[PDB]
Design a protein around this nucleic acid. Structure first.
Ligand code: NA
Ligand code: NA
Ligand code: ZN
Ligand code: ZN
Ligand code: ZN
Ligand code: ZN
Lengths: 162, 162
DNA sequence: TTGACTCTCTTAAGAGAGTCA
DNA sequence: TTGACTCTCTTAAGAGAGTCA
């Protein structure tokens, strides 16, 4: 809601409900050829999802609570960061999945950062492969790799130089 | 529609016009604390842009040629790759700026790959910092670094485990 | 045949708010 | 009050197509 004590109450009930979502074990690449284990708290695939949760998109959800007879609603993954600044250097803060598992709501698998910082983790080498993120990645990005480039830099004539 | 010889002629006229665009020398990071130099052929900021060129967006342009009475138009950066497959792994190929300078049309600074591969280069450490792209980067991605995370993984109670 | 404009669309990481029961 | 749906928007990497002289 509006008060400091009201926010904390929204965060506590949120944690409480998410703490009951089924816990699924996921083995993941860490970089450097090493492997780790993550434990995600995943929102169900279909209703009911849990007290206060409703699906607004294939993989989008919202959490809502009635405070003083006035209902408040937030993005399902933003609740843990309700007391932090909502922007940085003029950029909007977003909930970033360190586990790269959208259905997961485990706050130990989320961070609060710019959309650019958020996206970038998709290509990070991982905690054991070279990650330089101040708030370290939990795993190697699912998109990290050599890529599959169809054609590289090229010219037919002689008008350009690198 | 167009024959292979006709497409080649289109690539030749594109190179001839782009080659006359102002050439700007840029000093850039290559990773490993090393500094490099890139020479970008930049399309003007306002009309006229050059024979066959027209702006369709703040930072988007198109190239068009009329052959045998029929008008042909392509994205301005896609021309160098008109003789290559247009998709890979069920994904559409896109023009990727190795120099991260949108206005640049230097073909020696572009590659043809999926949008995901394309985006990823924004966070690459660079050719001298550990880049693993099969078609190597020309410089360090502008977004590579520790980031500016506002809040990290946290919980108030004890319902969660990593 | 050309130049200088106009418009909306794609992706995959993310969001906001309204309609019913 | 709480649940289950519906709709469109944001961003920064990229696109196709129309009008008019
Ligand atoms: Na993310
Ligand atoms: Na790019
Ligand atoms: Zn998770
Ligand atoms: Zn990282
Ligand atoms: Zn360039
Ligand atoms: Zn690279």
């Amino acid at each position: 809601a509006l008060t400091n004590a009201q926010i904390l109450a929204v965060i506590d009930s949120w944690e409480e409900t998410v703490g009951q979502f089924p816990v699924i074990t996921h083995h993941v690449p860490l970089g450097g050829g090493l492997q780790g284990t993550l434990h995600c708290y995943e929102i169900p695939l279909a209703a009911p999802y849990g007290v206060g949760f409703a699906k607004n998109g294939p993989t989008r959800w919202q959490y809502k609570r009635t405070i003083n007879q006035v209902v408040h609603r937030w993005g399902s993954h933003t609740v843990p960061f309700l007391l932090e600044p909502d922007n940085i250097n003029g950029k909007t803060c977003t909930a970033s999945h360190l586990c790269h598992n959208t259905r997961c709501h485990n706050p130990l698998h989320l961070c609060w950062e710019s959309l650019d910082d958020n996206k970038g983790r998709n290509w990070c080498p991982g905690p054991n492969g070279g990650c330089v993120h101040a708030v370290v990645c939990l795993r190697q990005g699912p998109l990290y790799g050599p890529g599959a480039t169809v054609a590289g830099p090229q010219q037919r004539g002689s008008h350009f130089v690198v």
